[model samples]
Target: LPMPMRFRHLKKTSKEAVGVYRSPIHGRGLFCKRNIDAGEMVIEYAGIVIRSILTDKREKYYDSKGIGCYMFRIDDSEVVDATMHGNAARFINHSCEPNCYSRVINIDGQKHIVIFAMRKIYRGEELTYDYKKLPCNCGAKKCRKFLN
Candidate 1:
């Protein structure tokens, strides 16, 4: 069984709106649930822990800095693997100018990611978060665009 989510799934209302279900684009990108405010806890990734891969030491396939995978390392605790959940994790999208941001903090000596709103949002707005935080070298002409 899968875990429950706090916020509702994305709903399609118009061309700008995102689908409530998993989108085929980018293998399932997470869209705006509705017109969100400037600051809000939009999403949360909850799962079990699996510690084995050395995040810093890259292997023949997997590399550090989370080259590819829905996995985040624990500051001093175990790790969690949420990539296999497919749609749930895939729903997230890539955006240079994102409206959401990831918050990292130490919980009981463990590290966790919390998705929070960087700015106010409107209905049908596609929920997007920055892949890399500033000073982001996206290399795009407007490289200094801050999503929040």
Candidate 2:
């Protein structure tokens, strides 16, 4: 499906609807301040687009500096590095039973990473999605022992 106009607008001007704060599941997380309907776009994973080859170099660079790296793979050749210039979407935590999900949307030939609500979400709820790997700490009932 094509990128929705409403979501594009939300990506540009709806920062107030989501905020970053301390999370029980991790260091920080994105929380909704208003209700988000199922299938609606929650937020865009805004960041710097870089070649996939640069990811390892940057990761090692950030590691040496003691900075946590946040990146999303767009394809085998591209990645979005959110650690340096990212919005609140970077703070979205992982969950076994996530309320939201990630999608790579194409807009005018450019690919964008966006988060969409998987189910109806309410105010004050922390936004989460199923990320592919790592140790799982999300407190969902069906929590997989590991994120893999």
Candidate 3:
């Protein structure tokens, strides 16, 4: 079977759908250009699709270069590389008390990384999601206090 891939059209997003800028929590982050209600679709995490084995190689290169890797795992064999053709979602930071969350959906045999607002968000508010078991650096009062 051929592994199919499909990946976007909010023009401002260039089909990526987001607005990214410098973030206080970290270096850069995704922010809202308009008010977003709870449950609303905020942005689509689009990127090039690659195999897990290839991802391993890229991870090493990025780590050696002291840069962040915008990789999202789709399955045991597939991963999304948001570095080459990614949008602002790459800037979405991790927060213990997050206002947003991500969902993995399939469309025409391809995986779509969709982020939705977990709560009402006003314009200009930075978008964030819980990294779950990963280290966090959001600085929220409920912060896990792991990342530095």
Clashing pairs in 3: 9-15
Please write out the lDDT profile of model 2 over residues 1-148, one tens digit for every residue: 3466755687555576789999999999999999988988888998999999999999999999999899877778988999999888888888988999889887778877889989999999999988745688899888896866
Which scores greater on TM-score, model 1 or model 2?
Answer: 2
* lDDT for residue 144 in candidate 1, whole number 0-100: 57
Ordering by lDDT: 2, 3, 1
Best prediction by TM-score: 2
Query: What TM-score goes with each of the models?
Result: 0.52, 0.88, 0.76
lDDT per residue for candidate 1 within 98-127, as digits (tens), equals 677766544556544556678887766666
Among all candidates shown, the one with the greatest lDDT: 2
lDDT of 3 at 119: 92
Clashing pairs in 1: 29-91, 30-91, 32-127, 35-122, 35-123, 37-120, 38-119, 38-120, 98-147
**What TM-score does candidate 1 get on C-alpha atoms?**
0.52
Measured with C-alpha atoms, the lDDT of residue 81 in candidate 3 is 89
Candidate 1 clash total?
A: 9
lDDT of each: 0.51, 0.86, 0.74
